[PDB]
Each structure stands twice: as structure tokens, then as C-alpha cells.
Amino acid sequence: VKDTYTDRLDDWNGIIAGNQYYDSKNDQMAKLNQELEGKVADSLSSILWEKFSNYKTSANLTATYRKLEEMAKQVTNPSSRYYQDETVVRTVRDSMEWMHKHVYNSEKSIVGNWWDYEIGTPRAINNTLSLMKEYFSDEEIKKYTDVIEKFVPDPEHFRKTTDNPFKALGGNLVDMGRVKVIAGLLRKDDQEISSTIRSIEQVFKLVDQGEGFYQDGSYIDHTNVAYTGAYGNVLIDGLSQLLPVIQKTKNPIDKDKMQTMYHWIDKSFAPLLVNGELMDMSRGRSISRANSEGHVAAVEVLRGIHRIADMSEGETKQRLQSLVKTIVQSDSYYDVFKNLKTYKDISLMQSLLSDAGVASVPRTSYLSAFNKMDKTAMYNAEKGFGFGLSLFSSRTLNYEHMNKENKRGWYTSDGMFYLYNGDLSHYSDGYWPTVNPYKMPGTTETDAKRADSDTGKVLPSAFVGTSKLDDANATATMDFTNWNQTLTAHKSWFMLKDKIAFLGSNIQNTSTDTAATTIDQRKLESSNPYKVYVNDKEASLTEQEKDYPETQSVFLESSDSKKNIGYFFFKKSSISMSKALQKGAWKDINEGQSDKEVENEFLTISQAHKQNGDSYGYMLIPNVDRATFNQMIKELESSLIENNETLQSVYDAKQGVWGIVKYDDSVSTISNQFQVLKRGVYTIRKEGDEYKIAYYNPETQESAPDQEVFKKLE
Numbered sequence: 001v002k003d004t005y006t007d008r009l010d011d012w013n014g015i016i017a018g019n020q021y022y023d024s025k026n027d028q029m030a031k032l033n034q035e036l037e038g039k040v041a042d043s044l045s046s047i048l049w050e051k052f053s054n055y056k057t058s059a060n061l062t063a064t065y066r067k068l069e070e071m072a073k074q075v076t077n078p079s080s081r082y083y084q085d086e087t088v089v090r091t092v093r094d095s096m097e098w099m100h101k102h103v104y105n106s107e108k109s110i111v112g113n114w115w116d117y118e119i120g121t122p123r124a125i126n127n128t129l130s131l132m133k134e135y136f137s138d139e140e141i142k143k144y145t146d147v148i149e150k151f152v153p154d155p156e157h158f159r160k161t162t163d164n165p166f167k168a169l170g171g172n173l174v175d176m177g178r179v180k181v182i183a184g185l186l187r188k189d190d191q192e193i194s195s196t197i198r199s200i201e202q203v204f205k206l207v208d209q210g211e212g213f214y215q216d217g218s219y220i221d222h223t224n225v226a227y228t229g230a231y232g233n234v235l236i237d238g239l240s241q242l243l244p245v246i247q248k249t250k251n252p253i254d255k256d257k258m259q260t261m262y263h264w265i266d267k268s269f270a271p272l273l274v275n276g277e278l279m280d281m282s283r284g285r286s287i288s289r290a291n292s293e294g295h296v297a298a299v300e301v302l303r304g305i306h307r308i309a310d311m312s313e314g315e316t317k318q319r320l321q322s323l324v325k326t327i328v329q330s331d332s333y334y335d336v337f338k339n340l341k342t343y344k345d346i347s348l349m350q351s352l353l354s355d356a357g358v359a360s361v362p363r364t365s366y367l368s369a370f371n372k373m374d375k376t377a378m379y380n381a382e383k384g385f386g387f388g389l390s391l392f393s394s395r396t397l398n399y400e401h402m403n404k405e406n407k408r409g410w411y412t413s414d415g416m417f418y419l420y421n422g423d424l425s426h427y428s429d430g431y432w433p434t435v436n437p438y439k440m441p442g443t444t445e446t447d448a449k450r451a452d453s454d455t456g457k458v459l460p461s462a463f464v465g466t467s468k469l470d471d472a473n474a475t476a477t478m479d480f481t482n483w484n485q486t487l488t489a490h491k492s493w494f495m496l497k498d499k500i501a502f503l504g505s506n507i508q509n510t511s512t513d514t515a516a517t518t519i520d521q522r523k524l525e526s527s528n529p530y531k532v533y534v535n536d537k538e539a540s541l542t543e544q545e546k547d548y549p550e551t552q553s554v555f556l557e558s559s560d561s562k563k564n565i566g567y568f569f570f571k572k573s574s575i576s577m578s579k580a581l582q583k584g585a586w587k588d589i590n591e592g593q594s595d596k597e598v599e600n601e602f603l604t605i606s607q608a609h610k611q612n613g614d615s616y617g618y619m620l621i622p623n624v625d626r627a628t629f630n631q632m633i634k635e636l637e638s639s640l641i642e643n644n645e646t647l648q649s650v651y652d653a654k655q656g657v658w659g660i661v662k663y664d665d666s667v668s669t670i671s672n673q674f675q676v677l678k679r680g681v682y683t684i685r686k687e688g689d690e691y692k693i694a695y696y697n698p699e700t701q702e703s704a705p706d707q708e709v710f711k712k713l714e
Contacts, residue, residue, distance in 0.1 A: 001138065005188040008245050009130045012182055015241045015307075017073050017131055018343030024079045028337050029346050037081050040074050043067035044088060048095060058112030061103065065124035068092055072131040089135055092128065096144065106150050113403075114159050118151050119175045126182040133186070141186050148183045155180050155196040169211045170221040171235030173203045177242040185245075194251040200242065203235070204257035213260075217267035218372035219282075224396045224458070226373045226413075228268050229282030233300040236264065240307035247311070261308055265320065269301055271368040271377045274386040274420050276302075276331025280427050281375050281390040281418065284399070285406035288590035293428040295331065299339035302328060306348055318358060325352040326360045333424035367474050367495065369466035371701055374413070376466050376476055376495075379420075383498050383623040384562055386420025389442075391478050393464035393698075397456040404591040407452035408437035415478055415491050417442035417502075421622055422562035423525055431523055433584040434600035439518045444489050444504065444609070444616075445482065446513040452589075457483075463663070467696035467703075469683040472497040475659040477681050477698060486511035490645070494659035496652040499621045499632075501659070503648040507614040517616050519567060519575060519605035522556070530603060531557040532577070536630065541579040541603065549574040553633060554605065557626050566621040566629045567605065570640040573618070579603040617643045619650075641670060656686040674712040678704070 014020050023029060043049070052060040052067075071092055074082040082088045110117050125148070129141050151161060155176045159165045168176045177200050184192030206213050211221045219228035239261075246252060272279045278298040280287045286297060302324055309320040328336045328349075340346050352358060368377040374396045378387035390413045392398045398413040400406060418427065418441070438447065463479035478491040487509050494501040509515040524530060532539045533555040534548050548554075551574065554567040569575075581601050586593035607616050617640060621632055641649040641658065647668050649660040658670055660682040669675050676682055680697040693706045 003188070005185050005190075006133060008248060009133060009182065009185050011245050011248065012185075012241075013076075013131050014344055015244060016127060016342055017076070018345070018347070019073070019077050019131075021343050021347045022077070022079055026346075026350075028350065029343050031337070032341065032343070032346065033077075033080065036070065036074050036077075039067070039070050040082060040088065043070060044091065047091065055103065056112055058110070058114075058116040062116045062120040062124060064099065065121055065128065068096065069124045069127045072128045075135070076131045089132075092132070093135070096128070100144055100147070104147055106147065110151075110162055114151075114162060118158060119179060122148050122152070122183065123175070123178045126178065126186065129186060130182060145183050145187050148179065152176075152179060155192075155199045168199070170203070170219075170227075171231035171233070171238065172221070173200065174235050174238035174242070176200065177238060177246075181242060181245065190250075193249060197246055197249070197251055197253060200239075200246070201253055201257055203239070204260040206260060206263070213264055213268055214370075214372040216370055216372050217271065217368055218370045219268055220373055220396070222400060222402075225284050225400050225456075226282055226370075226375050226390075226392075226396065227284050228370070228373070228375075229272050229278040229297065229301065230284045230286040232264075232269065232282070233278075233286075233297060233304075236269065236304035236308075237300050238304075240304040243308075244311055262316070262320065265305055265308070265323070267368075269305070270323065271366060271379075273298060273301075273327055274379055275424055276328060276334055276336070277420070277424065277427070279375075279377065279386075279388045279418065280432075281388050281412075281416070285402060285409070287409070287412075287432050288406040288586070288593075290430070290586045290593055293431075295334040295424070295428055296339050298331075299334075299336055302336070303340065303345050303349075306345070306352075310348060321352065321358045322361050325358055326362070328353075329360055330363075331424070333428075365471040365497075367468060367471050369468045369474060369476075371465040371696075371698070374464060376474065376493075378472075378474075378495050378500075380472070380498060380623070384422070385622045386418070387495065387500060388418040388420075389476055389493055390416040390418070391464055391476065392459060394459045394462040397458055399456045401455055406590060407454075408450075408589040410437060410450050410454065410483065411440045411443045411445055414440070414443045414445065414482060415480065416440055417493070419522075419565065419620070419622055421565065422560050423523070425525060426523055429523075430586075430598040430600055433586050433589060433598055434582045435523070435602065436521060436582065436604070437589075439516075439521055439604055439606065441518055441521050442502065444480065444487060444491065444507065444515065444517040446487055446509060446511050446515045448484065448486075448511070448513045450483070462699050465681070465696060465698035465701065467681040467683045467694045469657070469685060469692065469694045473655070473657050473659070473683055473685065475661060475681050475683045477661045479663075486513070487515055490648065490661075490663065492648045492661040494650045496650065496657055496659060497655060498624070499619055499652075501619045501650045502616065503643045503650070503661075504616045505643055505648060506645040507609045507616070508612050509609070514608060514610070515614075516606055516608045519554075519607060519618065520565070520620075521602055521604045522565065524579070524601045524603055526601060528559050528563070532603070533557060533626070534577075539577075541577055543578060543580040545576045545578050547574070547576055551575055553630075555626055555629055556603075561625045562623050564622065564624055564626070564629070566624055566632075567618055568621065568629075568633045568636070569618040570643075571615075571617060573607060573616070576606050576608070577604065615643055642668075658682070658684045660684065669713070672713075674710060676710055678709045680709070682709070684710075 221231040277294040365381040376389040392413040399409040461479035476493040489507040587595040
């Protein structure tokens with residue numbers, strides 16, 4: 001019966017469906033319609049389904065009710081095929097009940113996956129009945145939402161009826177939101193709404209230990225896994241729907257805790273965005289799915305950012321508005337509207353791009369050292385390139401392998417790095433399946449064989465992380481011990497504005513497998529091919545490992561100058577190079593994906609450390625044309641300060657910036673100007689007759705005063 005509890009499910013329906021805000025000749029909305037028409041039709045015209053028959057895998061039920069959720073939308077859509085349809089509606093009623101009694105009522109238990117019985121599945125019930133509370137009575141809505149309270153009678157915890165529950169935390173706590181808020185409003189069980197949102201306030205607290213967001217912008221979740229852009233998606237995108245409801249309710253959250261929202265936006269999320277890609281390191285295991293490539297899951301936050309803007313006031317609205325609109329304007333590879341699956345968001349998005357009152361704004365250079373999760377972020381404004389450094393410590397995990405998902409990301413945190421040049425498609429179009437998991441960029445690895453049944457571990461060392469000097473100058477380190485305790489090398493990175501040196505000393509293999517660092521593994525777009533200049537002259541590569549000893553330079557010329565990648569080797573080293581068509585399917589590294597073999601070309605560069613006590617020291621200069629790259633290497637001929645077993649450092653004498661990394665506590669005199677007196681990482685600039693110092697003890701995630709760690713001599 002008509003009431004207020006339902007006028008807030010009216011709001012809900014709009015956010016998740018958007019039929020209210022529809023238009024039959026709004027070109028983009030009509031593309032999402034054609035889609036829905038054929039969806040319903042592929043379910044409807046086959047139900048009861050063999051596609052989702054197997055019961056004992058519980059992931060099949062979510063899909064059952066989720067394709068019943070898909071009808072609800074078209075069913076209640078004034079401008080659709082199935083508008084007020086006799087059979088599509090009947091079908092729902094008949095297989096909403098026929099299901100309830102057999103598969104999904106109380107005298108039952110969780111097999112397969114709780115997450116279905118508990119989360120993904122109820123929200124699909126919730127979402128069906130909400131859009132069709134008019135094709136359903138009050139007590140009907142009661143009969144089916146009963147199951148909810150049986151599996152989730154307490155918005156503090158999850159996995160309840162089973163025998164080692166756990167506390168809803170991080171983005172997982174967001175789905176306590178939809179599953180109980182909406183479910184309550186349906187059952188007008190008014191406690192369910194107050195009781196819940198009390199626990200939904202728990203996610204706005206930052207922390208110094210555990211899951212959820214951090215002070216430095218880090219997001220941990222699932223014990224210790226870099227997830228600012230995988231669970232953080234589930235969080236920001238979930239809470240960007242609850243709040244329009246939640247705040248109109250009789251128990252609305254105090255406008256105090258709505259501030260940790262914009263701290264997430266800017267400190268945690270905004271830095272991992274570049275030209276419309278969320279960095280694959282923040283995604284963790286999500287990288288193993290074709291539906292969720294780099295550029296697509298970036299929209300899963302760019303909507304969650306906007307929804308927040310709409311329900312804001314003043315500068316907070318217009319600036320978080322520019323944040324979005326300018327970011328999507330800088331994305332030239334992906335049509336943003338391909339991940340907007342609800343018309344409210346489309347209407348909203350088309351508004352920005354139309355509205356010339358929201359000023360666009362280029363992004364300044366920035367560097368975010370997310371040490372509490374071991375990833376570093378970097379974007380150059382002047383040169384338009386990105387850089388990310390996937391590490392891990394004794395505090396964070398190298399890679400997650402859940403639900404038989406992500407089975408070959410072994411070394412994607414073993415010192416892995418990502419360049420982001422003008423090839424926006426780089427880590428996309430099937431990069432993850434077709435790329436060598438063994439020879440992963442930036443990493444030092446032997447060549448033993450891994451299984452797909454392996455698990456994410458942590459390091460035995462804690463000496464990892466970054467000192468930050470400014471938006472364009474920092475230094476990372478890693479006291480590596482690998483996968484099986486055969487290879488321990490110091491690995492240290494030095495990001496200095498328009499370049500990033502990879503030092504690394506003390507390389508030592510106690511193994512009969514050949515150790516080998518990978519300088520790079522770039523995917524190559526075919527319609528723009530590279531011209532590889534070894535040591536300043538051109539080359540011609542094949543699947544054959546060529547040899548190139550006596551190799552100062554390695555430059556990758558291109559049609560687009562913002563897609564070049566150079567490699568100055570301080571000490572003329574002995575590398576090998578190739579360019580093979582690598583094939584592979586998404587199924588190989590994640591069981592529940594298309595086995596359709598997918599093919600993508602790669603050019604690989606490498607160094608082999610044969611003798612026990614080897615080194616590697618080179619410099620990556622991107623977005624630099626050939627002409628300039630050659631005058632850059634003569635500019636930095638003496639730039640290697642040191643790269644031995646207890647000290648690694650570069651000098652960038654154009655800026656005047658040392659990047660430095662000690663391991664012992666000795667008194668190393670650098671460039672004859674100053675000393676550095678303590679174990680840790682430094683980043684230092686001369687700008688006058690004195691010094692600007694930034695030391696980070698990665699072991700104790702602490703800093704210290706200049707006096708303690710540095711005296712400039714004379």
C-alpha cells in the first residue's frame with residue numbers, strides 16, 4: 001500500500017535502473033536499451049536454464065535471479081518491448097516463487113559460495129521486487145525477502161550461519177548496505193534500516209592497521225592485498241548509490257563522515273587514474289577478466305565519483321565535477337558510455353560533456369607513494385607518461401589467487417613496473433592473457449616452472465618502500481628474496497621527473513636455473529610499428545633471441561613520439577631481444593573465462609645474470625624523441641654515483657637531485673658534497689647553497705630529522 005518506506009525504493013529504482021530519466025531518441029540511452037532487449041530475450045527465450053542449471057556451484061543462482069533482475073528493468077520500462085508484458089511478468093512471478101520454495105527457502109544451507117546466498121543473490125531479489133513492487137503485493141514481497149534475514153540477521157558480520165563468520169569490512173561492508181537497507185525498506189522492518197546504516201558508518205574510518213583505506217591513500221583489503229581499484233570499486237560505486245537513499249531516511253548519517261569520501265577520491269583513487277585507466281596493480285586479481293580491462297573498471301570509479309558530486313554542495317560539486325569530466329576528456333581510447341549500465345548515470349554524464357560551465361582542468365604532475373600497500377604512482381604532466389611500481393613487503397601480499405582467478409600473476413609484484421605512454425590500449429585488448437608471465441617487466445627471476453595451483457605469499461624482508469621529495473622526484477627499494485628462496489638481489493628504483501633508473505646489486509643465485517632480469521615486455525599495436533635502434537643504429541628482430549653485448553643505448557622510435565621508449569645503460573651491458581606473436585586465452589589464468597585463443601605481439605628485452613655477484617643498472621626515458629634521447633645520454637654519462645652491494649644512487653645534475661638507498665649504517669660520502677649516515681632510503685635536492693632532504697626508514701615506516709641522517713660537509 002502507498003507509503004513513505006516505498007517512496008525511497010522509488011529513489012533506489014532510479015539509481016540502479018533509471019527508467020524515470022529515459023528518452024527514446026537519446027542516442028546513447030538507446031544503445032543500452034538494444035542491449036537489455038536482447039539480454040532478457042536470451043534468458044526469457046531459454047528458461048529452467050541449462051546455462052545456469054548446475055546447483056552445487058552456487059554462482060549459478062546469482063545469475064538466475066540476476067537475469068530475473070534484467071526483466072524487471074525492461075518490464076518496468078515505458079519505452080521497451082516488454083513494457084507491461086503478460087508473459088515476462090508471469091514468468092517472474094512463477095519462477096520467483098517456483099524458485100523460492102525449491103532452491104531458496106529456510107530449510108537449506110550454504111554450499112558452494114556463501115557470497116551468493118548472502119550478497120550477489122539477495123541484491124538481485126531486492127532489485128527485482130523493488131522495480132516491480134507494483135506487480136507484487138506487500139506480503140508477497142515479505143515471503144521472498146524472508147530468506148535474507150535467515151542468512152544475514154546482523155549487519156555487523158557476514159558468513160553468519162556457517163561456522164567461522166567474519167566482520168563486514170572495506171568494500172564488503174558496502175554490500176551490507178544494498179542487501180539489508182533495500183531489503184528492509186521492502187519489508188518496512190525499520191530497525192533493519194537504522195541498525196544497518198550504523199554499521200555503514202564504520203567504513204568512513206581510516207586506519208593504521210587492518211583493512212579499509214589508509215592515511216597515505218593506501219587501500220588494504222583481504223588480509224593484505226593492494227585493492228584501491230578492485231574492492232575500492234565495489235566500495236565507492238556501492239556507496240554512491242546508498243547515500244541518496246540513506247540520507248533521505250529517518251536515520252541519516254551525520255555530514256561529518258561524508259568527508260572521508262573526498263579523501264578517498266583524491267588521496268586514494270585519483271592518483272591511480274591516467275587518461276581513463278585504473279592502474280592494474282591496484283586491481284589485484286580483477287586483471288584476469290576480459291570484461292574488466294584497465295579502461296573499463298576505471299569507469300566503475302568515475303561513476304562513483306560523479307554520483308558523489310551530484311549529491312554535494314558548492315565548490316565540492318563543481319570541482320569533483322571537473323575531476324571527472326577532464327579525466328574522461330583525456331581518455332581518447334575508450335568511449336566512457338560503454339560501462340554506464342543505468343540511465344541516471346548516462347543523463348548525468350552527457351550533462352557534463354554538454355555543460356561548458358564546468359571548466360576542464362589539466363592535471364599537474366604528481367607522485368603518490370602508497371607505502372602501506374607497496375605500490376608507487378607517477379604521472380608526468382610535461383611529457384604525458386605514467387609509471388607504477390608494483391612491489392610487496394613482509395606486510396603485503398604479492399598476488400591474490402581466489403575462486404580459481406589469477407593463476408599466473410606470480411611475479412606481478414616481484415618488482416614489477418608499468419609504463420603508461422600514448423598507447424592507451426597497452427595493458428588492454430587481451431594483454432594479460434597473451435603476455436609472458438615468466439618474463440614480467442622490471443622483475444628479476446630465475447627460470448624454474450610455476451604451477452597454476454600456487455598461492456600468494458609475503459616477503460621475509462621488510463626493507464621496502466619509498467621516500468618522496470616532490471611531485472616528480474622519489475626513490476623506492478626492495479630487499480628481494482623470491483618465490484622459492486633461490487635469488488636475493490637488491491632492487492632500487494629512482495624516479496626523477498622525465499626518467500626512472502633501475503639499479504640493482506648483490507644478485508646471487510643458489511640455483512641450477514638461469515637467473516635473468518627483464519628490462520621490458522612491451523605490447524605492440526600492429527598499425528603503428530616500432531623501429532628498434534640498438535646502440536644508435538637500426539635492427540631487425542624475430543622470434544630468435546638475438547644478442548647485443550656492448551650496448552650503451554636501446555631506443556624504440558615510433559610514428560607517435562609520445563610512444564617512444566629509450567633505455568640508456570650506464571655500463572654498456574649484454575642484453576638479448578626478440579619480438580614474437582604470443583597467443584593465449586583468458587581461461588588459462590582464470591578458469592571461468594572464454595577459452596577463445598587471443599593473439600597479441602610483444603617485443604621483449606632482457607639481461608642474464610650468470611655469475612654470482614652480478615649487477616644491472618639502466619635508465620628508462622620515455623616520450624622522448626630519438627633526436628633528444630641521444631643528447632640526454634651524453635647529458636648523463638657520469639650520472640651513476642654508485643651501484644654496489646650496500647649503496648645505490650643516481651645524480652640528475654640538470655635538476656640537481658640525488659636519489660639514494662643505503663642498506664648498512666655507514667658514512668657514505670656522495671658527490672663530494674654531503675654524507676648520508678643511516679640505513680634506509682633518501683631523496684635530496686640542491687636549490688641554493690643548501691639541501692632539501694627526504695629520508696624514509698622503510699623498515700619502521702618512519703622518517704627522521706636531517707640532523708640524524710645527513711650533514712652537508714664544509
